[PDB]
Amino acid sequence: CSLIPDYQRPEAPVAAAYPQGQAYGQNTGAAAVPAADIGWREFFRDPQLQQLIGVALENNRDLRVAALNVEAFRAQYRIQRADLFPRIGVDGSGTRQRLPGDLSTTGSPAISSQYGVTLGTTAWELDLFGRLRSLRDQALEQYLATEQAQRSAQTTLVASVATAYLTLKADQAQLQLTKDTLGTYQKSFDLTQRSYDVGVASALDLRQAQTAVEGARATLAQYTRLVAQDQNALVLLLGSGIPANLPQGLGLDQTLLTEVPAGLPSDLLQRRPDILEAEHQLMAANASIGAARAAFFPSISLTANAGTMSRQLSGLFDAGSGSWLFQPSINLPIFTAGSLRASLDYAKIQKDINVAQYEKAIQTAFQEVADGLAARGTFTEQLQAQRDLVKASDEYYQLADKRYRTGVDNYLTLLDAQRSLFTAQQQLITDRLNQLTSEVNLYKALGGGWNQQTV
Amino acid sequence: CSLIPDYQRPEAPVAAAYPQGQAYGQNTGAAAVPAADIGWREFFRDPQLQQLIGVALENNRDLRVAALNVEAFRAQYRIQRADLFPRIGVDGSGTRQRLPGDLSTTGSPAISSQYGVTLGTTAWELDLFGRLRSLRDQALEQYLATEQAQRSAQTTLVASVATAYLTLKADQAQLQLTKDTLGTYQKSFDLTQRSYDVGVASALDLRQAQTAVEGARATLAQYTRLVAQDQNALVLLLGSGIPANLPQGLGLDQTLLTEVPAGLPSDLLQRRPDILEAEHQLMAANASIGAARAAFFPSISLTANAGTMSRQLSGLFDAGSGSWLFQPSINLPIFTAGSLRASLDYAKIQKDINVAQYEKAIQTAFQEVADGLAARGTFTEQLQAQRDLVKASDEYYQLADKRYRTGVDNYLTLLDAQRSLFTAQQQLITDRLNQLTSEVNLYKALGGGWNQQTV
Amino acid sequence: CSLIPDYQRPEAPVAAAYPQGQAYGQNTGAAAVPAADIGWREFFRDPQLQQLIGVALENNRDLRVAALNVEAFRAQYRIQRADLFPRIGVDGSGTRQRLPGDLSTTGSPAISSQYGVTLGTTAWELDLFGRLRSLRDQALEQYLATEQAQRSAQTTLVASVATAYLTLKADQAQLQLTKDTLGTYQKSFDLTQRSYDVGVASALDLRQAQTAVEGARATLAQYTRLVAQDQNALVLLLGSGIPANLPQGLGLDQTLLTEVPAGLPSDLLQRRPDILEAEHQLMAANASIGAARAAFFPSISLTANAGTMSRQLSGLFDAGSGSWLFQPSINLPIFTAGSLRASLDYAKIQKDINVAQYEKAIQTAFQEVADGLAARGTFTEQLQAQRDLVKASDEYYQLADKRYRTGVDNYLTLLDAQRSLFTAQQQLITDRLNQLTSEVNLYKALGGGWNQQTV
Numbered sequence A, B, C: 001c002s003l004i005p006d007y008q009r010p011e012a013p014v015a016a017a018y019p020q021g022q023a024y025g026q027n028t029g030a031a032a033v034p035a036a037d038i039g040w041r042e043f044f045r046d047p048q049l050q051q052l053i054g055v056a057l058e059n060n061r062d063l064r065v066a067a068l069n070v071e072a073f074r075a076q077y078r079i080q081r082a083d084l085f086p087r088i089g090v091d092g093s094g095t096r097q098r099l100p101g102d103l104s105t106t107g108s109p110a111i112s113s114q115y116g117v118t119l120g121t122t123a124w125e126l127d128l129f130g131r132l133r134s135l136r137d138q139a140l141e142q143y144l145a146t147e148q149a150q151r152s153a154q155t156t157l158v159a160s161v162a163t164a165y166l167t168l169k170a171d172q173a174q175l176q177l178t179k180d181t182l183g184t185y186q187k188s189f190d191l192t193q194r195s196y197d198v199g200v201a202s203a204l205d206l207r208q209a210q211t212a213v214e215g216a217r218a219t220l221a222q223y224t225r226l227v228a229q230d231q232n233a234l235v236l237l238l239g240s241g242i243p244a245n246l247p248q249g250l251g252l253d254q255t256l257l258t259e260v261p262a263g264l265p266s267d268l269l270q271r272r273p274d275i276l277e278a279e280h281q282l283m284a285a286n287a288s289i290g291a292a293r294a295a296f297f298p299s300i301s302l303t304a305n306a307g308t309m310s311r312q313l314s315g316l317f318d319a320g321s322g323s324w325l326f327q328p329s330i331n332l333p334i335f336t337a338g339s340l341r342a343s344l345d346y347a348k349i350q351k352d353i354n355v356a357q358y359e360k361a362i363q364t365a366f367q368e369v370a371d372g373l374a375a376r377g378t379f380t381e382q383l384q385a386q387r388d389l390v391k392a393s394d395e396y397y398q399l400a401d402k403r404y405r406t407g408v409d410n411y412l413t414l415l416d417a418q419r420s421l422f423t424a425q426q427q428l429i430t431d432r433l434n435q436l437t438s439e440v441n442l443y444k445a446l447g448g449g450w451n452q453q454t455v
Helices: A047-059 A062-082 A132-198 A203-238 A265-271 A273-293 A339-406 A411-445 B047-059 B061-084 B131-198 B203-237 B265-271 B273-296 B339-406 B411-445 C047-059 C061-084 C132-198 C203-238 C265-271 C273-296 C339-406 C411-445
Strands: A088-099 A110-121 A299-310 A322-335 B088-099 B110-120 B299-310 B322-335 C088-099 C110-126 C299-310 C322-335
Touching: A047 A062, A047 A132, A047 A203, A062 A132, A062 C339, A110 A322, A132 A203, A132 A273, A132 A411, A203 C339, A265 A273, A265 A339, A273 A339, A339 A411, A339 B061, A339 B203, B047 B061, B047 B131, B061 B131, B110 B322, B131 B203, B131 B273, B131 B411, B265 B339, B273 B339, B339 B411, B339 C061, B339 C203, C047 C132, C047 C203, C061 C132, C088 C299, C110 C322, C132 C203, C132 C273, C132 C411, C265 C273, C265 C339, C273 C339, C339 C411
Parallel strands: none
Antiparallel strands: A088 A110, A088 C322, A110 A299, A299 A322, A322 B088, B088 B110, B110 B299, B299 B322, B322 C088, C088 C110, C110 C299, C299 C322
């Protein structure tokens, strides 16, 4: 009979509800369908990203290693399952010694020889008190923990691919907007050079208009470098090259993603993968306590074989040479120097170590979901304010264009208004990128994109 | 006999004094009470911070794992100490074999069965030359390194909780100043809207007063998220949530911490816990060299038991069946093919690796303490030059307020000085937060808070 | 015989050429001399940096651990190589037991005290099918992987030392320009104080002049702190202190690094050390399959000894007590419970894991070299624009100095032009530092400085 104690899951050391305050919105309560059960095909609505994630889900190498670890742990589980059964083997022996006359039976030094081949098992421990079954269950729980870790690696890879793709999508728009600002500065320098060549401006204004262009083209260079260094960072995450037959993507202002229900915090114990990984490692540490307890109890070993024995090698195949052996053995320790007790304390300590690691994983998940809820609460007001700033800059540019077309303002004032519009659009692009990255990280922290479609 | 070499502590490859220069102050020499002897209750002068650290030293799970690891290594040391004793047990054996008619002693095939219940040991290695004692000493030193690791984890947790609390305390005042800047901008927009509706201001001055207001609103919405996102970071480090009945904390302008003596570079060898951990690992490797040395010498084992044996089953514990067995064994390897010398060389290489890691731990501790001393040397004049800036900006604000009260300037010019006051106060708050974070990290680097009060 | 499968190096899962776009130059094709064959002495053309590397390569404690791990794994290889030879040792025995009246040959309880002193081998497994040979090959391949890891650590240390020294060289020039800016601000404050004393200006201008000098005293302190905290990191990387007999260094405007050719990605498989380390790990995992295949085949163990056996204690000297024993045995498993097949599957899975890790090492090296080439293609135009900006600011300042020498402008405007000149001159230093850091990292990713001279 077994000796593994009864497993009881520890309570969550978090608050009962997600945090409130000025940053957070109202709590939605329970979830009809959780964010884990929502597949990543319905979450990401950009069809270019839906193909890039599909490329990265079988061309990546971290996901491939995390997939192969599950097979590596099944191969370790089958080994530990195999030790309950006896190891039937063929064992051929030979012995040739020369005892002296004192120790030999004939009172004379004579060379004695015995040979024989048997079929049978040696030292086959009969798992009566549940030791080898406890090690089997420990290996099975470690396999389940690896199976959860593969899903966690897939969710991390999906959120990383979406983050890098949105980063490239933002930096290309930044490059185009800086390419417009450089042309504005170039036109302003051309008008200042004309005004200096006719004799109305001095060299002091020509040098300032030169410094503006020479400061803009350095920004153009250091944004071209960023576009290339994000293309390389996406190519490394994909595992292969970027596919050529890709569908046309969406702009940053469109609704790229779908909102997900946060749900209750107690759902995080049921859906997030690494919490389940820590729980299964806790169950393995629990199953080790049975193997530590069974060392006190008696162990039963067995040795049994049957075959042919003879004096010389020629008498092996002959009839009448049948032989068998049957050796049972029981063993019970009485006095160890506190050895088995200290091993039992070692198992009981590592169970509490896994309890503490499980609780720390729950607390980390709660913290990085509350951060995403704070970001979702505040980024709506932040982007509404930035979009109103962009609209007011557009109205200022249209009014400056009316004063230019009428004839009151020269062209340098209109060029001064264009880059003031472009700065406001650049800041909007950066804030929208931060809003999308926080939502992608919230989707990873809530259970992630393990399923492809919704269940 | 013992073959462990005489342990010698290696010299620290650092300079004899803390570095000088125009960033550092002047070295004070020796220290009557070094920083490890100063507890964290008399160091942090905030009564709220002390209660938060009192919560964190009980509820944080990362400290709990390190508090269980020392007991795990204690159990491992007890297991390795238990090897110096014979394992006494009850062995109930049995044997029933059928042999052919030539190897049997009668020339006829028969069954030679016996049974026996004995009590005693087997393979008890008599530690004469000190192999198992050297392994016991290695387990003892590996136990002694783990409580130094626990002390280092406690110092790191104390510095992390203090840094997170000061970051929260600074970010709340940053939010409080951002709200006032937005309240300034809203009045400056309402006055421009009134002046536009009256007829004096064009619609090119309304739009830029609108863009200023939206630029303030976006900063408010991104500081609220920061306050929430480091409230969650404090809650994660505290283990449990923030308590409700808290004392009244101190503002950033007051003396929040205590000045601490730097001391000498030769004190880091005595008081910083990770250097003592790296030293005890070196003592463990020096102990393992003795266990590798003992393999060249003859090993002595013993097998001795006493019990009752019989030919058939029913006559086991009946009288006239007492028996013993005594077996000494001596082994000395003559020709291992360079195996034992390779194991000895491997032990020496492990000792040299621990030497190099010990010296690297000393060098990194010196680098951290010298960074903290440089920052302590320069932040005093940095914050002096920063407080003079806020004093001059406040004098500018009061002179502009006198001009407004007299009737020379309008209410649009006074608000442009109030914003400069707010900008200078925000920069002062940021520099003060940097000064306090550097002093908390300097307190950690010198030996940290492991004691609670002064010793 | 040997059961190790044939090793086939996998294909590079990268593109056949480095990427091309707006940020890259032209692909120079194959390199007649590679980047890994260029020594670091010829690459770093600064006579101070060469001496700093010639100190750091001897005094660093990470390179010492990496250069001792190759000796540890050489000893671990020699241990496994020693297991092919039989262990020849002397064995002293002895047995005293009182069998009961049933199991003794006399019919009465007899005491059978025998002894023996012999020399020979026990349990010597004959490696006919290549199990221990494949284990020796696995240990040899892991030794070669550690050999590659040492060179990878040396290249990383060289790149870190060069980056830290160039950062110190940049920050000292930043200190000098900040001192010049502070002197300009102090002269402006003295002129404004004099104009306030005569009565031309008001206190409203004196406070604004005071704020600008406090803002420079607050920056001088933090740049002094940056220079000290960077010197401490350089002394940490060097191991020992900075030597006093340093030769004269060079400025950042002078050409410090030799241009290295990029070559082809197919050279990355040949000369980067952390690709060869992942290759030798794969060869070790390939030898592990030959180690796992040999479990299905018969193992031939041997015991063989010769010496003097006797009954009394005094019989071990004289003749007539000699003895030998020769005991061969073969074992062949027939039925296991899927244990050997699971171990073979585990070996194949551990081969495929190292296949995936080798491909990921190739992809990481490709991404790093591609980022370095994207930096090299853009930093030329960025630095050209920045030094043209510095030249235009110098011409503007010289025209302002002409207007001051003539009599039109006062000293307040001439001093105002110098601050813009210093701002451009210290943006150029940051851009030059970023270019040199990217070039050092591109040299490290291409194969790095393993050799001192050109090979």
